[PDB]
Amino acid sequence: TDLLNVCMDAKHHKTKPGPEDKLHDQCSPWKKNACCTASTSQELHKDTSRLYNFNWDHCGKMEPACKRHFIQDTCLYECSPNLGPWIQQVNQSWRKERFLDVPLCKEDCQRWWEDCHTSHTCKSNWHRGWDWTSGVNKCPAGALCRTFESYFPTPAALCEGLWSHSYKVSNYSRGSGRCIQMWFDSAQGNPNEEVARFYAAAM
Numbered sequence: 001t002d003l004l005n006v007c008m009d010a011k012h013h014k015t016k017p018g019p020e021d022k023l024h025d026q027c028s029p030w031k032k033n034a035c036c037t038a039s040t041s042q043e044l045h046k047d048t049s050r051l052y053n054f055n056w057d058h059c060g061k062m063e064p065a066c067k068r069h070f071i072q073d074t075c076l077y078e079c080s081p082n083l084g085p086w087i088q089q090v091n092q093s094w095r096k097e098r099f100l101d102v103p104l105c106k107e108d109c110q111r112w113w114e115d116c117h118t119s120h121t122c123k124s125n126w127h128r129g130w131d132w133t134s135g136v137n138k139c140p141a142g143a144l145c146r147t148f149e150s151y152f153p154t155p156a157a158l159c160e161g162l163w164s165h166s167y168k169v170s171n172y173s174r175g176s177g178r179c180i181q182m183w184f185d186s187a188q189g190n191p192n193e194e195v196a197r198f199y200a201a202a203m
């Protein structure tokens with residue numbers, strides 16, 4: 001149970017999960033229990049936020065249908081109090097902990113990949129390798145802009161590879177209670193609580 005209802009020790013996270021009534025737009029489904037502040041939830045909706053100075057439009061403008069998924073992902077990363085069982089210590093300059101091999105529901109990965117098909121990028125790992133010397137990430141030497149499909153030939157390649165394995169792709173369905181959903185209605189409770197509960201008891 002020590003892995004339940006926690007916030008990892010990372011760059012913006014709160015020390016502990018709490019109610020956040022004013023979570024902005026896409027993060028609001030987390031408003032009953034979040035690891036992010038309202039300010040953070042607000043900032044992550046912005047192009048090239050002050051959170052990480054990360055530019056989504058690094059190979060031209062990213063399609064809205066695609067960008068929403070990255071915003072959604074950032075909501076989960078910053079707000080989720082239910083990733084306890086996958087938290088690992090990594091000792092990095094901008095975070096002492098992170099999560100790895102979170103069982104992301106296949107349909108979520110599939111939808112993300114499909115909606116991002118018509119967008120563009122220059123790298124398959126977005127955590128390491130950028131040219132930051134202007135202050136925001138720019139394609140490094142040798143990295144050409146291409147379609148998403150080029151750098152991520154399958155859904156799993158994007159979902160698992162883009163954020164250096166924060167996720168593994170689960171063969172479980174949305175609503176199985178056996179995989180983490182990036183996209184959920186939380187009117188009747190956050191569905192990923194049950195997921196974290198289940199995998200914490202697996203030991």
Ligand SMILES: Nc1nc(=O)c2nc(CNc3ccc(C(=O)N[C@@H](CCC(=O)O)C(=O)O)cc3)cnc2[nH]1
Nearest residue numbers: 052073074077092093098126127128129130163166
């Ligand atoms: N699911 C998910 N998992 C994550 O870990 C995650 N992380 C971020 C934060 N993203 C980033 C990406 C790059 C850099 C960055 O400054 N990269 C540098 C190296 C940083 C270092 O010293 O470790 C670079 O090499 O370009 C920081 C934060 C956003 N969404 C996520 N979403």
Ligand SMILES: *[C@@H]1O[C@H](CO)[C@@H](O[C@@H]2O[C@H](CO)[C@@H](O)[C@H](O)[C@H]2NC(C)=O)[C@H](O)[C@H]1NC(C)=O
Nearest residue numbers: 105106107156169170171172173174176178179
């Ligand atoms: C992931 O789940 C799917 C079903 O949602 C599994 O599919 C079935 O697999 C068996 C063989 O193992 C087939 O007889 C069925 O035809 C499959 N169902 C359909 C309609 O596709 C799939 O095997 C699972 N993947 C893994 C690796 O366990």
Ligand SMILES: [Cl-]
Nearest residue numbers: 065068111115
């Ligand atoms: Cl839609």
Ligand SMILES: [K+]
Nearest residue numbers: 080081082192
């Ligand atoms: K969650």
